[PDB]
């Protein structure tokens, strides 16, 4: 289930973080514009960049902590607030987060490996609700 | 489901309230001691007391609002904090709440009226967790 998924992802954080982030950018290519260092770079080019692996790991590590801090896929309001008041997120809307999760759920459903995909969708929905309540437009 | 069950209970609140609370006191009689003048009385004697219906109803009014304020059966932290800080709950530990929800779930399952008894199970456990987090022993 959802708790095992956190362990699956944590077990191979760098690989899952990179694969899921790329799946997001592939499904929603216009989202790349937010990451200026990644424009015009193939996947193998992106992996040769220290910041790409290091960013994507720090992103998914945080997501996993928020996921682990949740009860029945409802995140802490404090965690949503962290994400809203992060300076790297100043220009974002809840729509950006919706997109990331749609891509994450799609990736899970297409992977061999078992994931509790319904639960990640639900977590995504609850997190979007929380981001809105914490002031993200 | 859970959300509809809230409406069901609200639709016949005093009846459901007294009956569920009676189910609680009959399953766990030693519990009448937190209350005044409950001991030594049959169900019908209790239901004719001046206060019994009024106080049981008020408990359930608030229980339903806490259930309504929840997301996926996870109550609000501030709702838990209210229940912990109520002077009239000063003698309580989370176990008292545990016994109340065990009886409540047992009641729903035995009833003719369809309830999502397992969601109430979940909600009870999550409320206990929240009371602990709020500082209840
Ligand atoms: C729950 C989902 C998300 C989590 C947990 C998260 C976490 C983070 C963290 C921790 C950083 C700082 C990492 C660092 O500087 O080393 C970050 C940076 C950033 N994030 Fe978010 N993020 C999330 C969603 C998003 C979304 C939806 C977008 C936009 C589509 C976004 C855009 C950025 C950008 C552009 C940066 C700066 C790039 C960089 O770190 O070099 N993130 N993310
Ligand atoms: C989530 C479940 C509960 C809710 C929403 C709740 C809510 C309330 C409310 C709103 C009152 C004020 C009633 C009034 O003054 O008329 C109250 C009083 C009280 N509650 Fe709680 N309660 C809950 C669980 C419990 C449990 C499990 C116990 C003990 C086993 C308990 C013991 C008391 C006592 C002793 C009083 C005052 C004496 C009395 O009203 O007869 N309650 N409750
Ligand atoms: O910050 C994130 C981005 Br941008 C995309 C995906 Br998918 C997950 C996270 Br966390």
From TrEMBL, chains A, B:
Entry keyword Nucleotide-binding = no
Which residues are noted in the entry as heme b 16-binding? 89, 97
What residues does heme b 12 bind to? 55, 89
The UniProt GO MF terms for this protein read:
heme binding; metal ion binding; oxygen binding; oxygen carrier activity; peroxidase activity
- In which residues is heme b 4 bound? 89
InterPro entries in the record, alphabetically? Globin (IPR000971), Globin-like_sf (IPR009050), Globin/Proto (IPR012292), Mb-like_M (IPR044399)
Which keywords fit this entry according to its UniProt record?
A: Heme, Iron, Metal-binding, Oxidoreductase, Oxygen transport, Peroxidase, Transport
Binding site residues for heme b 14: 88-89
What is the top-level taxon of the source organism? Answer: Eukaryota
The entry's heme b 10-binding residues are: 55, 89
Query: Do the record's keywords include tRNA processing?
Result: no
Annotated positions binding heme b 9: 51, 89
Ligand binding (heme b 6): 89
Q: Which Gene3D superfamilies match?
A: Globins
Q: Where does heme b 15 bind?
A: 89
Residue numbers binding heme b 7? 36, 55, 89
**Residues noted as binding heme b 8 in the record, renumbered to the chain:** 38, 89
Q: Where does heme b 13 bind?
A: 58, 89
Q: Name the family the entry cites.
A: Belongs to the globin family.
Protein name per its UniProtKB record: Dehaloperoxidase A
Where does this protein come from, organism-wise? Amphitrite ornata
């Amino acid at each position: 289930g959802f708790k095992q998924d956190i362990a699956t992802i944590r077990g191979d954080l760098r690989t899952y973080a990179q694969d899921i982030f790329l799946a997001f950018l592939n499904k929603y290519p216009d989202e790349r514009r937010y990451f200026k260092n990644y424009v015009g770079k193939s996947d193998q080019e992106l992996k040769s960049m220290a910041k790409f692996g290091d960013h994507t790991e720090k992103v998914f590590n945080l997501m996993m902590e928020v996921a682990d801090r949740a009860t029945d896929c409802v995140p802490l309001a404090s965690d949503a607030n962290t994400l809203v008041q992060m300076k790297q997120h100043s220009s974002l809307t809840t729509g950006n987060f919706e997109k990331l999760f749609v891509a994450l759920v799609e990736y899970m459903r297409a992977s061999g490996q078992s994931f509790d995909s319904q639960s990640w969708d639900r977590f995504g929905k609850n997190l979007v609700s929380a981001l809105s309540s914490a002031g993200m437009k």
